Every structure is written in C-alpha cells, then in structure tokens.
C-alpha cells in the first residue's frame with residue numbers, strides 16, 4: 402500500500418557556501434524543497450526540521466579529536482591549524498567555510514532523526530536530501546564530506562534492527578560507509594558506481610568485506626555512459642537477491658544524483674526516471690526505508706531528481722510541466738521535470754553487465 406513519509410529539511414541549509422568555483426552547492430537542497438513544495442507534495446507527507454546533531458552524537462562514529470577539530474576550525478583561525486587541517490584532510494576538496502560545523506550538524510541531524518522516526522515505527526519512510534555524505538571517514542574528511550551522516554543513521558537503526566541494508570546509487574563508491582561496516586555482518590553495503598581512474602578509487606567487485614563481514618560488502622563497478630536500460634538490467638535482480646539472501650529489517654538508500662546524464666562531475670547517462678526506478682524497486686520490499694541525498698553538481702537536475710523521488714516515495718503522480726517556483730529560470734530552456742539522456746557512448750556492454758552480475762550472485766551464494 403501507500404507509505405507514510407517523513408521528510409527532513411532545514412531552510413538554513415541553502416545558505417552554506419563551499420567557496421567560489423567549488424562544485425558542491427548546498428543551495429541545491431533549497432531548490433529541491435521549493436520545487437516539491439510548488440508541486441504540492443507537502444500535502445501528502447510530514448515535514449520536520451531536524452535538530453542540530455551534537456559532537457556527542459557524531460562521536461558515536463567519529464574520533465573525539467576529529468570532531469573537536471571540526472567544531473573549532475574557522476576561516477579566521479585556519480593559519481593556526483595548518484597541521485590539523487592536513488591530518489584531517491580539510492582545506493582543499495573539503496574547505497573551511499563559515500558555518501561548516503552547523504552544516505554538518507543539520508546534514509547529520511536529518512539522517513539520525515529519520516532513523517529515530519523509523520525505529521519508533523512512526524513512519525514507513527524518512528527522507529533527508531541534505532544527507533548521504535558517504536565519503537567521510539572516522540577521522541578525516543573526504544570528497545566534500547566531513548561527517549558521515551549515513552554511518553550515524555545506521556548505528557541508530559542497529560539499536561532496533563539486527564540487519565541493516567545500505568544501497569548506494571551515487572556515481573561514486575560508498576567508501577566511508579563500506580569502511581565503517583566492513584567487518585560486520587550486521588550491515589550489508591551495496592554500491593553501484595563508476596570504477597577506473599575515478600574518485601575515490603575503491604569499490605572493486607573483489608572487495609567483499611572481511612572477518613564476520615566477509616561477503617557483506619557488494620560492489621558493482623561500472624564504466625562511463627551507463628544508461629537507464631543497462632542499469633535497470635542489473636539493479637532489480639541484484640537487490641532482489643540481496644533481499645532474499647540477507648533479509649534486512651531496515652534499508653538505507655543513498656540517492657546521489659551525480660549518476661544522472663549531464664552531471665558536471667559525473668560520467669553516467671541515466672535519466673531521472675531511470676534513477677528513480679531504483680527507489681521504486683527498493684520501496685516494493687515494504688521495509689522501513691531511510692532515503693538520503695548525495696552528490697550532484699548539475700543542480701537543476703538534482704532538484705528534478707529528488708523532487709521526483711519524493712513523489713515516488715509518496716506514490717503521487719506529478720506532471721512533467723514544472724510548476725512556477727523560486728528557481729524557475731534554472732529549469733530552462735524546457736521547464737519540464739524529466740530529462741533526456743545524452744548521445745554519449747555506453748562503455749558498459751550488455752555482456753559486461755551480466756558478467757559482473759553473475760560474479761556478485763556467486764558471492765551472495767556464500768551467505769548463511
């Protein structure tokens with residue numbers, strides 16, 4: 402049936418600024434929100450403003466030293482922290498900006514608040530588009546991510562769920578999440594991603610986990626230009642098998658939109674419908690589901706993607722004609738919700754997709 406959806410958003414999020422030229426634009430979350438408000442989707446779901454997660458909350462995963470650094474560092478005291486900045490991988494990809502810590506607190510607060518909601522059985526789905534920062538590590542920033550909201554949310558779910566399944570359709574590998582849970586069977590991580598001279602450089606299919614977590618990390622490496630049909634060929638089958646073999650009681654789905662056609666940093670060729678089919682698939686298992694954001698650098702298409710995927714969560718059909726909104730000019734020249742793929746070559750042959758799939762299936766036969 403139709404699911405109750407709780408959605409997390411702080412309108413201050415759009416005002417954080419990574420700096421001139423930096424492709425990460427928090428503003429995209431405000432565009433997303435404004436677009437789905439203008440489609441009327443607030444009528445169908447509960448909207449919450451998340452708390453700011455505390456340093457205490459964050460050190461459920463991150464080191465005390467790293468979190469102490471994140472809450473002290475500012476543009477005005479950077480010169481005095483040059484050593485700490487290098488150690489914690491801050492100051493370049495992951496710059497120091499005004500309100501950095503508060504940005505992390507809001508990002509993280511959405512993900513944990515959604516997980517609490519799900520644990521209390523007061524929603525079927527929770528949505529935090531400001532979350533999904535899958536590259537942050539225990540004691541270091543990486544790939545524009547500082548605090549790993551996903552890891553903290555899963556730790557919250559593990560309080561009431563013996564097995565949690567994490568699925569990642571961001572074009573990048575979910576390295577920080579895989580790393581955190583690599584040696585436990587209580588979290589299975591499934592990542593689909595570009596692989597081959599590409600950030601972060603991990604997610605080989607031969608990376609399957611270790612110790613009690615061996616066979617609970619699943620990696621589908623892809624080449625440039627995958628399209629809706631190649632992706633669709635393998636996502637439903639892999640997820641069905643994972644569900645069947647792993648039998649999770651809760652699911653976290655990272656929905657990074659840098660896997661869309663025309664993403665400024667991405668090299669895939671998915672449409673918003675192709676992307677969103679993944680949400681559709683996971684929804685059908687009828688499990689407590691936390692949906693998070695992620696990467697995405699062509700921001701009009703990020704707003705489309707996460708608006709449509711909100712509508713998917715709600716089983717609420719919306720028209721292709723975009724309603725008027727505060728960012729209307731960004732959606733030219735067509736002013737429609739859905740996007741076309743490019744004519745870029747798909748380097749992923751059908752044979753390649755089926756072969757990688759069959760290798761993952763052999764691995765999944767190793768579960769209890």
Ligand SMILES: CN(C)C(=O)[C@H]([NH3+])Cc1ccc(F)cc1
Pocket residue numbers: 425532533534535536543544545546571572573600657659666694695696697
């Ligand atoms: C470019 N790059 C590393 C990426 O896009 C990754 N997906 C990491 C990431 C960035 C922003 C975000 F909001 C969530 C995750």
Ligand SMILES: [Ca+2]
Pocket residue numbers: 569570571572573574575592593594
């Ligand atoms: Ca991924």
Ligand code: NA
Pocket residue numbers: 582583584585586587588589590610614617618
């Ligand atoms: Na694991």
Ligand SMILES: [Zn+2]
Pocket residue numbers: 571572573657659695696697
């Ligand atoms: Zn990404």
